[PDB]
Amino acid sequence: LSTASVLAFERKLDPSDALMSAGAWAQRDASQEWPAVTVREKSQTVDVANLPSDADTLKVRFTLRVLGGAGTPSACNDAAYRDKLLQTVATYVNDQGFAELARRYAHNLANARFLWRNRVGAEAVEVRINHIRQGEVARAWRFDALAIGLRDFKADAELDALAELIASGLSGSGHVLLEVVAFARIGDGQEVFPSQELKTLYSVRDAAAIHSQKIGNALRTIDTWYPDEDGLGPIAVEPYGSVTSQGKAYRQPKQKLDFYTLLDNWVLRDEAPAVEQQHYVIANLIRGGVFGE
Amino acid sequence: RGTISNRLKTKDRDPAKLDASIQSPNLQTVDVANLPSDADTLKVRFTLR
Amino acid sequence: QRQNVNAPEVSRLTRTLQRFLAKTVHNNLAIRQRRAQLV
Amino acid sequence: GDWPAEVGNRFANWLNRAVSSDSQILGSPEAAQWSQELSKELTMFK
RNA sequence: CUAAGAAAUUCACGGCGGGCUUGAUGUCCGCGUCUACCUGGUUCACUGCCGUGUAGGC
């Protein structure tokens, strides 16, 4: 009949803080003892994180758990709204499962978009994704991140295999944890761009790193179904789909394509189109958030 | 630094500012706890009398 | 006073609230802070 | 429970008709917001 | 066009003297606070063939 006063969706596709470490190209195989890059200060005064002078390659590394059961909220206030939401996500996956969203997540893990600023000036990027079964490597991938585009979604055998593995983890048929390690050729003594704190760069234990929410924002840029002119490309799935650095807000609620109007039409009165906005609202609840009255 | 992703308390006409604008970020400070990068299991220890 | 028979800061708050939401300077957090303060 | 929501409603209606600048209309959602604000601070007594 | 119309109160002082409030006490029992986030639109920088000579150089 109505929406609950409190509604909480927990995070799926759980990332970690991407630890960064310098190294040389063609040494990506035995890249375990690689020294982590640290933040220095210079001339009011600012922070800067470069590489060591004998290293032409950055390597970031983070572990991504995927959870599954994304349509089950962690908090509600009425049982009827949770039953209706579970029925809508259940008939979503019974019409078509996680085949488009898992393919786009495998794309955003294939092209190293979690390299936020380090990707745009990189000569060659290689992403290695290891599916850690018990404590060892079960299936290992080796993706050309620059050959796979940022705004076009290709078709490939290995990428559809990664899409099927992320789909199996997202449906709940298996536990999926992926060690994702990206080698980016940037140059000798070039500058890396970790996440900046409240200019102070973020670090954990004498090691510059990217935040977990920045990596979670980067692999979430899959939204291509919105009334923009063609040329923007994929944006991240936020409700009232915003780019606060650009100062614009696509799917503003005067147009009826935001997350909340599509949710309260797709659940409370059974109204959404065939493929596009259902994928948008399901990816938005895959992200998680706080909704309600 | 998040985005304003919540229910808006009123429509486009708003004389007295209740909700934030969507074309504007929001800054928060949160507490987080992670394992170290070389430690992959959590140990929870408690006594029970 | 008799035994037989005989016989404004709220307005300041309302006036400064009206004069505050009359004008706008960039419409940021401090405006909503002062509005919550006055209410 | 008859008093607090109605007292917050009529207080916010008083504040609606009292505070109306050159931005002329104030409106009903602001009335509900100030109504529930005073209603929480009145049901806080017990 | 006023119960109108007018009016110097003025001076000084010793409040002193003393004192047991006493005992005693059982606050005592519970608890899920959750949920998601890009600090980025910016570091006007070491020099030097320089011209310190307000334009001049990677």
Swiss-Prot record, chain B:
Effect of gene knockout = Mutants lose phage DMS3 infection-dependent inhibition of biofilm formation while there is normal biofilm formation in the absence of phage infection. Decreased production of crRNA in the presence or absence of phage. Disruption of the entire Y.pestis-subtype CRISPR region disrupts crRNA production but does not alter phage resistance (possibly OLNs PA14_33350 to PA14_33310, and the flanking CRISPR loci), indicating this CRISPR is not involved in phage resistance.
Give the domain of life.
Answer: Bacteria
Supply any other comment. In this bacteria, Y.pestis-subtype CRISPRs do not confer resistance to phage DMS3 or MP22, but instead are required for DMS3 infection-dependent inhibition of biofilm formation and possibly motility.
Q: Record's family?
A: Belongs to the CRISPR-associated Csy3 family.
Q: How does it assemble?
A: Part of the Csy ribonucleoprotein complex with a probable stoichiometry of Csy1(1),Csy2(1),Csy3(6),Cas6/Csy4(1)-crRNA(1). A Csy3(6),Cas6/Csy4(1)-crRNA(1) subcomplex is also formed.
**Role summary:** CRISPR (clustered regularly interspaced short palindromic repeat) is an adaptive immune system that provides protection against mobile genetic elements (viruses, transposable elements and conjugative plasmids). CRISPR clusters contain sequences complementary to antecedent mobile elements and target invading nucleic acids. CRISPR clusters are transcribed and processed into CRISPR RNA (crRNA). Cas3 and Cascade participate in CRISPR interference, the third stage of CRISPR immunity (Potential). Involved in crRNA production or stability.
Q: What is this protein called?
A: CRISPR-associated protein Csy3
Organism of origin: Pseudomonas aeruginosa (strain UCBPP-PA14)
Swiss-Prot record, chain D:
Q: Which residues form a coiled coil?
A: none
Tree of life domain: Bacteria
Which residues pair up as cystines?
Answer: none
Annotated knockout phenotype = Mutants lose phage DMS3 infection-dependent inhibition of biofilm formation while there is normal biofilm formation in the absence of phage infection. Decreased production of crRNA in the presence or absence of phage. Disruption of the entire Y.pestis-subtype CRISPR region disrupts crRNA production but does not alter phage resistance (possibly OLNs PA14_33350 to PA14_33310, and the flanking CRISPR loci), indicating this CRISPR is not involved in phage resistance.
Extra facts: In this bacteria, Y.pestis-subtype CRISPRs do not confer resistance to phage DMS3 or MP22, but instead are required for DMS3 infection-dependent inhibition of biofilm formation and possibly motility.
Q: Which family is this protein grouped under?
A: Belongs to the CRISPR-associated Csy1 family.
Subunit structure, per the record? Interacts directly with Csy2; part of the Csy ribonucleoprotein complex with a probable stoichiometry of Csy1(1),Csy2(1),Csy3(6),Cas6/Csy4(1)-crRNA(1). A Csy3(6),Cas6/Csy4(1)-crRNA(1) subcomplex is also formed.
Described by its record, this protein's role is as follows: CRISPR (clustered regularly interspaced short palindromic repeat) is an adaptive immune system that provides protection against mobile genetic elements (viruses, transposable elements and conjugative plasmids). CRISPR clusters contain sequences complementary to antecedent mobile elements and target invading nucleic acids. CRISPR clusters are transcribed and processed into CRISPR RNA (crRNA). Cas3 and Cascade participate in CRISPR interference, the third stage of CRISPR immunity (Potential). Involved in crRNA production or stability.
Spell out the protein name for this chain.
CRISPR-associated protein Csy1
Provide the gene name from the record: csy1
